[PDB]
Design a protein around this nucleic acid. Structure first.
Ligand SMILES: [K+]
Ligand SMILES: [K+]
Ligand SMILES: [K+]
Ligand SMILES: [K+]
Ligand SMILES: [Mg+2]
Ligand SMILES: [Mg+2]
Ligand SMILES: [Mg+2]
Ligand SMILES: [Mg+2]
Ligand SMILES: [Mg+2]
Ligand SMILES: [Mg+2]
Ligand SMILES: [Mg+2]
Ligand SMILES: [Mg+2]
Ligand SMILES: [Mg+2]
Ligand SMILES: [Mg+2]
Ligand SMILES: [Mg+2]
Ligand SMILES: [Mg+2]
Ligand SMILES: [Mg+2]
Ligand SMILES: [Mg+2]
Ligand SMILES: [Mg+2]
Ligand SMILES: [Mg+2]
Ligand SMILES: [Mg+2]
Ligand SMILES: [Mg+2]
Lengths: 117, 200, 69, 142, 420, 154
RNA sequence: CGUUCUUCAACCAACGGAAUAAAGCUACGCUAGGGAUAACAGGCUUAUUCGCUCACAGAGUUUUAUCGACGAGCGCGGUUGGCACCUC
RNA sequence: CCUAUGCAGCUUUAGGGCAGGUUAUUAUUCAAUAAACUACCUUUUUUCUGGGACGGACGCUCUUAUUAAAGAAACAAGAGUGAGCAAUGGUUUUUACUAAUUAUAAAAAAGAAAAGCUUAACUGCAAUACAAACAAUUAAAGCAGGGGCAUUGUCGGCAAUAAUGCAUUGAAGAAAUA
RNA sequence: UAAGUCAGACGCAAAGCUACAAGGUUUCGCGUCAAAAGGAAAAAAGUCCGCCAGCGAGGCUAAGGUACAUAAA
RNA sequence: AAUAAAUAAGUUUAAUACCUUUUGCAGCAUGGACCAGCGAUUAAAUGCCGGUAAUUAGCAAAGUUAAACUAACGAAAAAUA
């Protein structure tokens, strides 16, 4: 069981009797800590959902689809994840478009260490 | 059989076979399956070779004193500590704890996946050979406390286990591999003075 | 005796070796005329009264009866 | 209103090729469905038991009157039907007891050890007591 | 049964009457009645706090009896571990044993081929010889017998130890049994420094009127020792021993007869008794003749000069017997199992020294092995080749030459395997 | 120990046999007597009595007497006086030429045998020996013990 | 007077039988407990009850105007029941 | 309303007692004993159960459904039993026979009946198994003694599956002590 | 462990009792709950997928989904 | 069930107290208005089974108490003489 010092440190921002009354605050503190364990798990699900929505919106502006892009990347051996792709569509439109054109049309110029073999 | 007492039949049969074997020798003395048993092997198929990857991070020197940084017009994507980062000079990133480095040291990151500017883009499949990113180690810190709590209503079950994660902080200094677009060149000194201490 | 029952008896301190106890008066030269007692027949009836009987032969203690008045 | 009689487990105890030792019960039955073969016996309630060391066998026979008869046999170890097999069985019985005692361990006692000796009657050991208990050999004539 | 749970053997009336008694000594009976090494270890473990020197002496003696039961193989792991633990108690009680207890302790540990540590062995010897052996007077015949043979087997060769022991036992030699005296004679023969002492002569003289009481095994050993000790036969023991052997030639076991027969042949007293000697060997050849005794029979017969006869090919059967022992093949026949034939005990690796000796003796016999399809010596060399193939590491330059000489002598020198 | 009401332990019969009074004696093995003599704790050149056994440590505490039992192979004579003996011990000692005598002592007489100094230090006469034993014990004793034993040579 | 062996008998049929034996009333009642268990109400079920369809035999006597059946299926939760899920 | 290591009061031809009065017998110059009547004291008055009461039931065998190993419950169903036999036991011989039980496809080197002789319907022990919480319950090779019928086999009751009761207390025959 | 437990529940599949009724009752085979968080079906003890040492804004899948609510043709 | 996880700070998503008792309770089943103090497997003797040591224990002071131990089948032959 938490001590008085621990309980009131956790409950400093609660409302009414939940702030300074031990019996009321102790039950409020334990329920809140239970919410946090569930919250950290759900955070990982929600953020990935947001990345996909932004990627899909950018793809369709050019006439493409999210599912077509993911399949196309794996065929080209490109391993950029969804967090990076989402940021490219929002802040780097030109680089995001270049990735789409390579996947769809494959018209990029290859680079070799020895330019003139 | 109705009884729940465990049966002793296997014990009674074993005692009979052991007594017979002890006193009466067998007639056969060989077994073909044992005679031609071959040597033990690890597997029946060739092993699958592994795919090489560029080095993650390596030290190249130390920082001598206070410095300043300016903004540039290039960016890249680098893989580090199990996750990818989009970085440009003067950025600060937070990663898991990195072993074998100290504060005020310069490290080299080679797993570069994408380079871009305002006039060109280079895509790695999956990595770009001949590109790198430089960074400075700024912190090895313990993050904020995370309180872990479990309880089961009406079962007299309660567990409390606070913890503090370990992390590392870096500041991006330079991105190498792609030239800035015309008119975007930084024509002044930008970074610190580095004492090179890694010659191979 | 069954193993479960035997351990309880041993745990309680049962250590008898003979069906009955020897009689010191039977040792030659050690007969005391003063401590003479005719041999008696051993009683085989357990005391099963739940009020003043053996606690090991009843489930719980019962209240005592009233005295005549 | 209800009630049920205690169950009797009729049926075989061993199959073909299983090893048995003297005295072991092979079949429990209410009527003589199976008849005794070689190296077996039959109780007054049609219980069939083995009389030697060997393996169990089953066989069917057609009689003169068209009826079907079923036998239970015990076959010697190496198909040895000579009269010298009896002494080999006696040795195997002694050995089997030794094997069991070794497996069980020393703390599974197989003989009693009292603070007194059991009486002797007709040259054997008896579990019944005598009227008076006396030390053996602590008295002289007259 | 009815008394105990399922699978628990019923009581033995013989054992039950021993344990159920009005008299004390329960722990001694438990260790004496143990039937295996593991059982005895459990008894000692559960009774550690009440063990005494008498309990330790019996425990070491029991190792002799357990080893005898487990014959046909070397000392097993459980026996070795049990002996090691017993030694710690011997050191603890080394100053509390009596002469009799020490005698039992040495005998038991010697029978298991266990070498007592020199420091501990010295302490035990000191106890026996302390006070000039005045405490040896309060000992029975069996205690003296085990003292002589027990220490001799251990290898204790202290001159002062044996000098004091001989002096104290000397006056009692005429009153010891024939078997006890024979054991003393064996020790005297093995100890060189007592060969020409008055003790050796006193022992031989004391044995003169007790020849008739010697057992067949002791009688055979006494005749062997007397031949080496008194080649001149001044005491007359050899004459008396030879006379008894002639009278009771067929009344002794095969092993004793072979040993006595070999001694006579090396004494150059051969007589036309070969016909009588051959029949017992062929009658009992599959049993009562291990590898060591088989070699002894060959040397005696070859030295005597008996030649192979059509009716009784003794050399031919001996080769088959030798091949059987080397290969170790067993038989499941009921007669063989009940007869306790030596060949069914299993496989026991034999020293290469015996193999060379047997090969040389067979070669000296004068019979062929290779040329004929079915020759008397064919089975032995065929088995020898198979056995040697699996132990090439033990073959050296000298051993190979020795066998090669034997192979050429018999008539196998073409570099090919034996026909059989 | 209550079993619910079945009371299975009291469903067994009762035996009333009286064990022999000799279970109250101290038991001494012949093999243990010899070991003391060999070690030198007992003098085998003179008669051995229960007083010597008590002082030597063979017997711990005597209230009634000493019972001698067992088999042993002896090479020298022994003369020992005890209260009871079996037949195995008698044969073992007599085989070597010894003599075993069963001596009858009373309660007061046994005290004088074991602790004579307890009477002389107080200037008290020693207890007197018994005259005879009850005929019911015929075949149990050979002679009446004397409080000061008469020692002899062996 | 006591012990052992060979044996039997009585109440144990509430038949693992023992505190030697041995019936009732309480609406004048009291205490400790249960929705682990009933009476009123809710719930589940639908045999029964009620309704509809098929069936058109039989009465009316050209009309399935009107009345109406053997037998089968489906529905209702309002009749008489079953269960013991919520509350002592 | 039901359930208790239940409590109390009341009632009686439920058990036991005599301790006041009456009555009966006996004894000394207000007493002693009690199968009686009144008064008083103390104790007992199961459980299961589609809630409890009312009714019914409580041991032990056979059979039916839950398939063709065993086992398996309900106040489910269909039938027996708390014995009998001095031969209807044991064992030999003969043959125009092959049944019956509460119920049942047992059984031909087996049974039934007929004829003869018999008491093993014993004394002292017993390997090893079936079953089983335990207690007890079931089958049994083999060893010693005395017997029966055969003349070298079988008999430690009855075709098999029910005809039963711990310990305590009491009683009888014999033997050993004191 | 000379411990606790001897109030069990439902799903699919059988049989007895009831009316080839009951979230009824009595046995039996497997599973789940009891003592089991997470995901799908609306809420969801017993159904379907699957067993939580901790943290992270990495990736691939199961049952089930892929015009809006609501991630994906 | 008045909080949690996040956020461009506008907001968005997740989310039916605890205890006791139960086959199953957010329970329309039981207890608590709140704070401070007080409030429940303790002691003795004996017995059984593990762990850790002493190497018999107590008195007395060359002698006594307590405990423990005390016959089971004398069975081995390893000599290249
Ligand atoms: K009852
Ligand atoms: K209510
Ligand atoms: K009901
Ligand atoms: K308040
Ligand atoms: Mg996830
Ligand atoms: Mg009935
Ligand atoms: Mg009862
Ligand atoms: Mg009330
Ligand atoms: Mg209810
Ligand atoms: Mg119910
Ligand atoms: Mg009731
Ligand atoms: Mg039992
Ligand atoms: Mg006969
Ligand atoms: Mg019969
Ligand atoms: Mg119950
Ligand atoms: Mg129950
Ligand atoms: Mg139900
Ligand atoms: Mg529960
Ligand atoms: Mg995917
Ligand atoms: Mg969408
Ligand atoms: Mg409920
Ligand atoms: Mg309240």
């Amino acid at each position: 069981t938490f001590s008085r010092e621990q309980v009131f440190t956790f409950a400093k921002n609660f409302t009414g009797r939940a702030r300074n009354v031990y019996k009321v605050a102790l039950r409020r503190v334990e329920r809140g800590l239970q919410h946090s364990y569930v919250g950290r798990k759900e955070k990982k699900r929600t953020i990935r959902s947001l990345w996909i929505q932004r990627i899909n919106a950018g793809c369709r502006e050019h006439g493409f689809a999210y599912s077509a892009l993911i399949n196309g990347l794996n065929q080209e051996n490109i391993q950029l994840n969804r967090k990076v792709l989402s940021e490219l569509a929002m802040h780097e439109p030109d680089s995001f478009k270049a990735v789409l054109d390579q996947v769809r049309f494959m018209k990029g110029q290859e680079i070799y260490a020895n330019v003139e073999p | 059989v109705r009884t729940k007492l465990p049966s002793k039949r296997p014990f009674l049969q074993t005692a009979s076979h052991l007594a017979v074997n002890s006193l009466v020798p067998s007639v056969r003395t060989n077994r073909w399956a044992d005679l031609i048993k071959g040597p033990a092997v690890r597997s029946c198929i060739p092993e699958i070779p592994e795919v090489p990857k560029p080095s993650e991070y390596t030290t190249i020197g130390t920082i001598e004193g206070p410095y300043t940084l300016n903004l540039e017009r290039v960016f890249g994507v680098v893989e580090l500590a199990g996750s990818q980062y989009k970085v440009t000079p003067d950025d600060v990133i937070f990663t898991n704890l990195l072993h074998g480095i100290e504060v005020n040291e310069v490290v080299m990151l080679e797993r570069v996946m994408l380079l871009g500017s305002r006039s060109n883009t280079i895509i790695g499949r999956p990595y770009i050979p001949g590109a790198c990113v430089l960074a400075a180690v700024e912190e090895h810190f313990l993050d904020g406390t995370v309180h872990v709590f479990k309880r089961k209503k009406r079962k007299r079950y309660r567990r409390y286990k606070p913890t503090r994660p370990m992390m590392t902080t870096l500041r991006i200094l330079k991105v190498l591999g792609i030239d800035p677009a015309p008119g975007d060149e930084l024509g002044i000194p930008s970074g610190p003075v580095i004492k090179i201490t890694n010659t191979e | 005796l069954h193993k479960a029952y035997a351990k309880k008896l041993l745990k309680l301190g049962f250590k008898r070796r003979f069906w009955t106890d020897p009689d010191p008066q039977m040792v030659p030269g050690f007969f005391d005329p003063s401590k003479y007692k005719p041999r008696e027949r051993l009683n085989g009836k357990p005391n099963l009264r739940p009020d003043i009987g053996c606690p090991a032969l009843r489930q719980s203690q019962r209240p005592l009866k009233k005295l005549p008045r | 209103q209800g009630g049920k009689s205690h169950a009797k487990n009729w049926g075989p105890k061993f199959g073909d090729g299983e090893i048995v030792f003297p005295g072991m019960i092979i079949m429990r039955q209410k009527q003589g469905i199976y008849s005794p073969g070689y190296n077996v016996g039959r109780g007054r309630d049609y219980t069939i038991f083995a009389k030697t060391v060997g393996y169990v066998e089953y066989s069917k026979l057609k009689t003169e009157r068209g009826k079907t008869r079923r036998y239970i046999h015990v076959v010697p170890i190496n198909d040895d039907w000579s009269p010298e097999y009896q002494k080999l069985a006696d040795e195997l019985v002694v050995r089997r007891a030794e094997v069991k005692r070794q497996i069980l361990g020393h703390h599974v006692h197989t003989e009693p050890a009292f603070h007194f000796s059991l009486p002797q009657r007709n040259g054997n050991m008896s579990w019944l007591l005598n009227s008076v208990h006396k030390f053996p050999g602590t008295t002289t004539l007259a | 049964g009815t008394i105990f749970n399922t699978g628990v053997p019923g009581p033995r009336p013989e054992v039950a009457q021993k344990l159920s008694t009005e008299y004390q000594g329960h722990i001694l009976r438990m260790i004496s009645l143990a039937e295996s090494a593991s059982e005895l270890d459990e008894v000692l473990w559960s009774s550690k706090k009440h063990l005494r020197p008498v309990h330790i002496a019996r425990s070491c003696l029991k190792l002799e009896y357990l080893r005898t039961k487990e014959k046909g193989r070397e000392v097993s792991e459980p026996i070795k571990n049990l002996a090691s633990e017993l030694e710690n108690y011997v050191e603890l009680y080394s100053t509390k044993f009596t002469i009799g207890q020490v005698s039992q302790l040495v005998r038991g540990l010697s029978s298991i081929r266990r070498n007592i540590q020199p420091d501990l062995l010295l302490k035990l010897a000191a106890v026996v010889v302390a006070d000039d052996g005045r405490q040896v007077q309060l000992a029975n015949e069996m205690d003296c017998r085990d003292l002589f043979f027990g220490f001799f087997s251990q290898g204790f060769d202290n001159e002062l130890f044996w000098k004091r022991l001989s002096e104290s036992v000397l006056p009692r030699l005429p009153y010891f049994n024939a078997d006890v005296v024979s054991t003393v004679l064996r020790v005297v023969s093995g100890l060189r420094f007592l060969h020409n002492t008055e003790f050796a002569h006193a022992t031989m003289t004391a044995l003169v009127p007790k020849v008739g009481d010697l057992s067949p095994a002791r009688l055979a050993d006494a005749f062997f020792s007397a031949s080496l000790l008194d080649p001149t036969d001044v005491s007359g023991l050899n004459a008396k021993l030879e006379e008894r052997f002639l009278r009771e030639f067929t009344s002794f076991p095969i092993k004793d007869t072979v040993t006595m027969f070999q001694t006579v042949t090396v004494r150059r007293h051969s007589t036309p008794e070969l016909a009588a000697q051959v029949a017992p060997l062929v009658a009992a050849q599959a049993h009562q003749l291990p590898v060591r005794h088989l070699r002894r029979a060959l040397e005696g017969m070859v030295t005597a000069g008996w030649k192979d006869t059509a009716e009784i090919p003794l050399y031919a059967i001996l080769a088959k017997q030798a091949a059987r022992l080397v290969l170790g093949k067993q038989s499941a026949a009921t007669s063989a199992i009940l007869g306790k034939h030596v060949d069914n005990q299993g496989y026991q690796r034999t020293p290469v020294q015996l193999l060379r000796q047997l090969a040389r003796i067979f070669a000296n016999t004068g019979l062929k092995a290779g040329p004929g399809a079915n020759q008397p010596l064919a089975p032995y060399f065929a088995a020898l080749q198979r056995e040697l193939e699996g132990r090439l590491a033990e073959l050296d330059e000298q051993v190979t030459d020795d066998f090669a000489e034997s192979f050429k002598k018999v008539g196998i020198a073409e570099g090919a395997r034996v026909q059989i | 120990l209550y079993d619910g009401g079945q009371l299975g332990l009291v469903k067994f019969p009762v035996t009333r046999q009286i064990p022999s009074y000799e279970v109250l004696y101290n038991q001494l093995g012949v093999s243990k007597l010899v070991e003391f003599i060999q070690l030198g704790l007992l003098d085998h050149t003179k008669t051995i009595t229960m007083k010597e056994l008590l002082n030597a440590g063979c017997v711990s505490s005597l209230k009634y007497g000493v019972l001698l039992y067992g088999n042993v192979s002896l090479s020298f004579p022994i003369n020992i006086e005890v209260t009871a003996c079996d037949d195995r011990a008698r044969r073992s000692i007599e085989a070597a030429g010894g003599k075993v005598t069963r001596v009858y002592y009373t309660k007061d007489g046994l005290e004088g045998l074991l602790f004579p100094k307890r009477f002389t230090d107080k200037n008290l006469p020693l207890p007197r020996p018994a005259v005879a034993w009850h005929p019911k014990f015929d075949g149990k004793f050979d002679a009446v013990g004397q409080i000061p034993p008469v020692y002899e040579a062996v």
